[PDB]
Amino acid sequence: TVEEANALLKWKSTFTNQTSSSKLSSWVNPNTSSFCTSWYGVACSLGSIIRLNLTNTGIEGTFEDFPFSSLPNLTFVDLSMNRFSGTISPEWGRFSKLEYFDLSINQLVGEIPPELGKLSNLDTLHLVENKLNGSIPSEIGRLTKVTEIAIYDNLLTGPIPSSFGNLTKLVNLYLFINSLSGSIPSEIGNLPNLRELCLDRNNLTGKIPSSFGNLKNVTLLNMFENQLSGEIPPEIGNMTALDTLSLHTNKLTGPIPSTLGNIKTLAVLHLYLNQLNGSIPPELGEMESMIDLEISENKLTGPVPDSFGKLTALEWLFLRDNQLSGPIPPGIANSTELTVLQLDTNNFTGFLPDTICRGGKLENLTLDDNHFEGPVPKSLRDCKSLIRVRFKGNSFSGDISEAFGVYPTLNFIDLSNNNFHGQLSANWEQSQKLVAFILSNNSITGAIPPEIWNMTQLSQLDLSSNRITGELPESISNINRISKLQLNGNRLSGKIPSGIRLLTNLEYLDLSSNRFSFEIPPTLNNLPRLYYMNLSRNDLDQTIPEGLTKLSQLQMLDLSYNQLDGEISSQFRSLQNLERLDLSHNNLSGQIPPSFKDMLALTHVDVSHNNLQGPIPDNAAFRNAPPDAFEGNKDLC
Amino acid sequence: NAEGDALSALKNSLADPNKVLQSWDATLVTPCTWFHVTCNSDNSVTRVDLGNANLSGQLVMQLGQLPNLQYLELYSNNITGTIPEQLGNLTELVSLDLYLNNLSGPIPSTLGRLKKLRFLRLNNNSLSGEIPRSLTAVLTLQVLDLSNNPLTGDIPVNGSFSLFTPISFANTKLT
Amino acid sequence: PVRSSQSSQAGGR
Ligand SMILES: *[C@@H]1O[C@H](CO[C@@H]2O[C@@H](C)[C@@H](O)[C@@H](O)[C@@H]2O)[C@@H](O[C@@H]2O[C@H](CO)[C@@H](O)[C@H](O)[C@H]2NC(C)=O)[C@H](O[C@@H]2O[C@@H](C)[C@@H](O)[C@@H](O)[C@@H]2O)[C@H]1NC(C)=O
Ligand SMILES: *[C@@H]1O[C@H](CO[C@@H]2O[C@@H](C)[C@@H](O)[C@@H](O)[C@@H]2O)[C@@H](O[C@@H]2O[C@H](CO)[C@@H](O)[C@H](O)[C@H]2NC(C)=O)[C@H](O)[C@H]1NC(C)=O
Ligand SMILES: *[C@@H]1O[C@H](CO)[C@@H](O[C@@H]2O[C@H](CO)[C@@H](O)[C@H](O)[C@H]2NC(C)=O)[C@H](O)[C@H]1NC(C)=O
Ligand SMILES: *[C@@H]1O[C@H](CO)[C@@H](O[C@@H]2O[C@H](CO)[C@@H](O)[C@H](O)[C@H]2NC(C)=O)[C@H](O)[C@H]1NC(C)=O
Ligand SMILES: *[C@@H]1O[C@H](CO)[C@@H](O[C@@H]2O[C@H](CO)[C@@H](O)[C@H](O)[C@H]2NC(C)=O)[C@H](O)[C@H]1NC(C)=O
Ligand SMILES: *[C@@H]1O[C@H](CO)[C@@H](O[C@@H]2O[C@H](CO)[C@@H](O)[C@H](O)[C@H]2NC(C)=O)[C@H](O)[C@H]1NC(C)=O
Ligand SMILES: OC[C@H]1O[C@H](O[C@@H]2[C@H](O)[C@H](O)O[C@H](CO)[C@H]2O)[C@@H](O)[C@@H](O)[C@@H]1O
Ligand SMILES: *[C@@H]1O[C@H](CO)[C@@H](O)[C@H](O)[C@H]1NC(C)=O
Ligand SMILES: *[C@@H]1O[C@H](CO)[C@@H](O)[C@H](O)[C@H]1NC(C)=O
Ligand SMILES: *[C@@H]1O[C@H](CO)[C@@H](O)[C@H](O)[C@H]1NC(C)=O
Ligand SMILES: OC[C@H]1O[C@@H](O)[C@@H](O)[C@@H](O)[C@@H]1O
């Protein structure tokens, strides 16, 4: 002790930036009467230190003056969560009785010495969250008594040593955040007691070893975010204890092995972001424990098997971004726990099944860019748990007020590019959590129900390219949280409400291709975030108000195809960020204000088909203007 | 994806009292359905309209991961810290609006790689240093403003800056 | 504490 205690005390002297409130204030008397009872972090057997525990003590220093020659009986060493810097000495391999070695969460650098391989009594090795570099020494394979190795979040390079096949007692192998290289050693498939194998987020190349079919005890296999190639070995189906299988973000090829259906314990399966091809094996319907099934972003083809109706515990089904085709089998939506159904970016056909929301738990449903047709099933109308619903780009049909019910939890919905008809039901107001209502390019008619403006939480509203009638009320001001407002391409009439003044958060306004009939509100001068305003193809009938020139942030402003008259106010020179102007097809008169030469951001102008006269101020926009941009004026010099 | 993870990184470095960044759902494939972000036809981010958002915090180097980001509007906020030189990785770039903030430190010399830059406004800040010579080689810059900043050094008219007027350099303590 | 890595979910639309 007295030699051990004095040797430890000499090492404590190396510590830097240590305050008097440190836990190591207890290291005072080198006599055994206090060394083995009152020194923080030390424990003795027969009066000799066997245990050194200094986790999370705030020590800053090095192991250079660690008393290797003075502590022969160390069997438990934890120095994690400190500020130790330097390298791992080969002397660490001298502690013949050591069983637990932890130097995680530190600032160590350099290679791992081969001498660590001669710690024949070691049970657990932790070197986590350091900056160690080099290749793992082959001598680590001498640790026949080890059960857990964790060296993840480091700068390790080179291959995994094939000598690891000698570590028969290993149950846990954690090496994920690293830069290991080469093929997986096939001896790793022969570890009998292995339970968890995490090799994800590395630079591994080559095929998955077919010997992995021997790992009858492994429940977790993380190898995602690698450069694995070839095909998934069918022998993986012999891994009858496997719970989670994640090979996502790799360069695997070929079809899914039909032998995945043998693993009755498999609950999670991530195969996404790869290059697998072929058709979905019908045997995948026999993965009875399956909960999370993800095959997104691949090159799969063919129909989904009806056997998916046997997956009674399925909650997430990710099949998006593939080349699957045909109709959806009703078995897909059989699960009462089904919560997420992502199917966009595919080549499907036909109708949605009536099982779509059988359990009443479906949250997210995505069908973008497919060839679905027919009406909305009744189970989806009455499904109240919807959060995200994406129907964009299909041939769906039916009455829009008869298709959809009430959704208290609805957050986002996009029904654009479809064939819905009818008039909007006021039921949408009850979806008080909705923030995005996007319904463009449909056959919808009628007037906008007034209750829509009472949806205060709405931030984006897109009813463009429809046949909606009526006029916008002054209650338009109720939705001031809006930032994108797209009502263009409709049959909206009457005057533009001055309540648009109070929608301050507005970034993007599109009211063009409509039938607005009276003069522009002079009070639209307080939109400090608007960069876009399009009022083209309407019936506005007076002079451009001076309030428009006060919106500093406009980038584009299109007032074309109107009955606007009067003179072009020179105060448009104030719009310092304006890049585009279009005033064509109007009855504007007078001369173009010569102050416009100072609009350096202006790049595109059109003034054609008007009643103006005089020479053009000289700027970049006017010089590059084509002859169309001045057509049909009176006396433009 | 990669662009969404980068904008998620910004979302974690800014204190958002006004709940502007709420729509920035990180588990989406692309951030193109988020608010205040607009994409082109290829689902690559081209605009970030975060002006006057009452955001507080520090910028994040991951802002250089938007190759197609043409307009970056972070003006009129209480953001602090420095300008990370990784913004020079914005190969396609038109507008840089960081004015009206609490930013400090130098003007990274890496901004000379944004040869497409038209508008650069950094006024009303705590920036300190000298104007890099690299900014003189862009030849696309049209509108420039470094007012209300405690910089130093003489006004660098190396050719491109020949067209600019003292309002661009007013209250700068340059000379 | 030493933990095992968790697989992250696929991106949704
Ligand atoms: C493994 O990393 C060692 C540390 O290098 C630095 O570590 C951090 C402080 C950080 O700054 C990191 O970016 C650096 O790379 C290398 O040793 C250092 O090498 C440098 C010069 O390369 C030298 O000035 C240092 O004195 C030296 N320190 C120590 C403790 O050795 C390792 O050595 C390298 O390996 C050689 C094969 C060769 O690549 C050479 O560049 C280095 O000597 C690194 N080992 C590797 C990369 O295998
Ligand atoms: C839009 O809403 C306003 C008021 O908002 C709600 O009013 C209550 C019905 C209740 O749901 C509150 O939580 C909301 O604040 C409606 O106008 C009010 O209607 C009530 C009748 O219940 C009446 O007593 C008030 O005087 C009305 N005015 C105000 C200023 O409160 C309005 O009718 C709604 N519009 C539509 C089309 O439904
Ligand atoms: C602490 O270490 C000392 C030094 O190695 C041990 O003393 C040795 O004990 C072994 C048997 O365990 C003997 O073969 C040696 O001859 C002893 N050498 C000396 C110099 O005493 C001591 O046993 C260790 N204590 C514990 C509890 O392991
Ligand atoms: C080493 O020290 C740490 C803390 O100094 C001990 O960690 C505690 O362990 C017990 C049992 O696992 C837990 O109830 C506590 O919550 C832990 N505290 C932590 C993790 O901060 C650890 O047990 C010590 N080990 C030995 C062998 O003494
Ligand atoms: C979808 O629905 C059920 C799954 O719950 C299957 O039909 C029967 O469900 C009962 C539930 O108690 C089972 O006992 C029966 O064995 C099921 N039928 C058969 C033939 O096994 C149905 O098969 C599922 N799949 C579809 C309709 O494709
Ligand atoms: C404002 O919206 C109108 C549509 O309402 C846009 O007009 C388009 O202009 C191009 C240019 O020739 C035509 O090819 C399109 O056919 C027009 N669309 C329609 C529906 O007629 C106009 O471009 C928009 N303005 C701005 C500045 O974006
Ligand atoms: O006064 C509303 C009354 O009728 C609702 O049905 C509407 C109504 O007939 C309207 O005139 O035509 C619409 C179709 O264009 C119908 O949907 C009906 O739901 C009833 O409950 C309501 O009280
Ligand atoms: C699985 O692990 C247990 C641990 O008790 C072991 O007894 C069994 O032999 C292992 N299965 C094998 C090696 O097939
Ligand atoms: C492992 O699966 C293969 C199928 O590829 C099979 O031929 C083999 O018999 C299985 N292993 C055992 C021990 O049965
Ligand atoms: C919807 O958009 C497509 C392409 O954008 C185009 O055919 C038209 O504008 C609309 N078609 C239908 C069928 O709604
Ligand atoms: O509700 C809070 C949680 O919401 C989720 O959408 C994510 O943003 C999480 O990072 C966050 O912790």
Other Cβ atoms within 10 Å of A31 Cβ, number: 11
At residue B125, what are phi and psi to the nearest 5 degrees? -145, 180
Distance (Å) of CA A255 to CA A85, A228, A274, A320, B42: 48, 15, 11, 17, 29
For chain A, the straight-line distance linking the first and the last C-alpha, in angstroms and rounded, comes to 104
Dist. CA A602–CA A575, nearest whole Å: 10
- CB of A426 within 6 A of ligand 2: the answer is no
Atom 9 of ligand 6 has which residue's CA nearest to it? A536
Report CA dihedral (A233, A237, A238, A243) to the nearest 10 degrees.
120
In a domain, A28, yes or no: yes
- CB of A238 within 6 A of ligand 8: the answer is no
Distance A425 CA to ligand 7 centre (A): 10
| Contact assignment for A342 to C13 by CB distance below 8 Å | yes
Q: Assign residue B34 a region: left if phi > 0, alpha if psi is -120 to 50, beta otherwise?
A: beta
Contact between A479 and A458 (Cβ < 8 Å): yes
| Interface B-C: count of C-beta contacts within 8 A | 11
At residue A582, what are phi and psi to the nearest 5 degrees? -140, 105
Which residues in chain B have their CB less than 8 angstroms from residue C11's CB?
Answer: 1, 27-30
Structurally, chain A folds into a number of domains equal to 1
Dist. CA A471–CA B64, nearest whole Å: 45
Looking from the CA of A515 toward its CB, the CA atoms found within 13 Å total 10
In a domain, B76, yes or no: yes
Atom 6 of ligand 9 has which residue's CA nearest to it? A235
CATH code, domain with B138:
3.80.10.10
In a domain, A506, yes or no: no
DSSP A553-584: T-SEEE--SS--EEE--GGGGG-TT--EEE--
Dist. CA B51–CA B35, nearest whole Å: 13
The number of the ligand nearest the C-alpha atom of B22 reads 11
Distance (Å) of CA A136 to CA A118, A172, A463, A627: 14, 17, 61, 72
Continuous segment of H or E residues that includes residue A158: strand A155-158
What is residue A52's DSSP assignment? E
Dist. CA C13–CA B28, nearest whole Å: 6
B36 has binding-site annotation: yes
Dist. CA A494–CA A539, nearest whole Å: 10
Dist. CA A240–CA A597, nearest whole Å: 77
CATH code, domain with A38:
3.80.10.10
Dist. CA A567–CA A363, nearest whole Å: 55
Structurally, chain B folds into a number of domains equal to 1
Q: What's chain B look like in SS3?
A: CHHHHHHHHHHHHEECCCCHHHHCCCCECCHHHCCCEEECCCCCEEEEECCCCCCEEECCHHHHHCCCCCEEECCCCEEECCCCHHHHHCCCCCEEECCCCCCEECCCHHHHHCCCCCEEECCCCEECCCCCHHHHHCCCCCEEECCCCCCCCCCCCCCCHHHCCHHHHCCCCCC
Q: What is the resolution of this structure in A?
A: 3.1
B24 has binding-site annotation: no
Which residues in chain A have their CB less than 8 angstroms from residue B143's CB?
Answer: 576, 600-601
In a domain, A108, yes or no: no
Dist. CA B63–CA B85, nearest whole Å: 10
| Contact assignment for A601 to B51 by CB distance below 8 Å | no
Instruction: Identify the domain containing residue A30 by its residue range.
Output: 1-86
B29 has binding-site annotation: no
Elucidated via? X-ray
Instruction: Identify the domain containing residue B78 by its residue range.
Output: 2-169
| Residues A367-376 as b or e (16 or more Cβ within 10 Å = b) | bbbbebeebb
In a domain, B7, yes or no: yes
Residue of A519, A611, A601 whose CA lies nearest to A559: A519
For the record, the structure tokens of B152 come out as: 């130093």
Dist. CA A41–CA A22, nearest whole Å: 12
Continuous segment of H or E residues that includes residue A33: helix A32-35
Report CA dihedral (B74, B76, B82, B85) to the nearest 10 degrees.
30
Return the bridge partners of A49, or none. Answer: A44
Residue A286's SS3 state is helix
DSSP A226-244: S---S---GGGGG-TT--E
Which residues in chain C have their CB less than 8 angstroms from residue B30's CB?
Answer: 11
In a domain, B174, yes or no: no
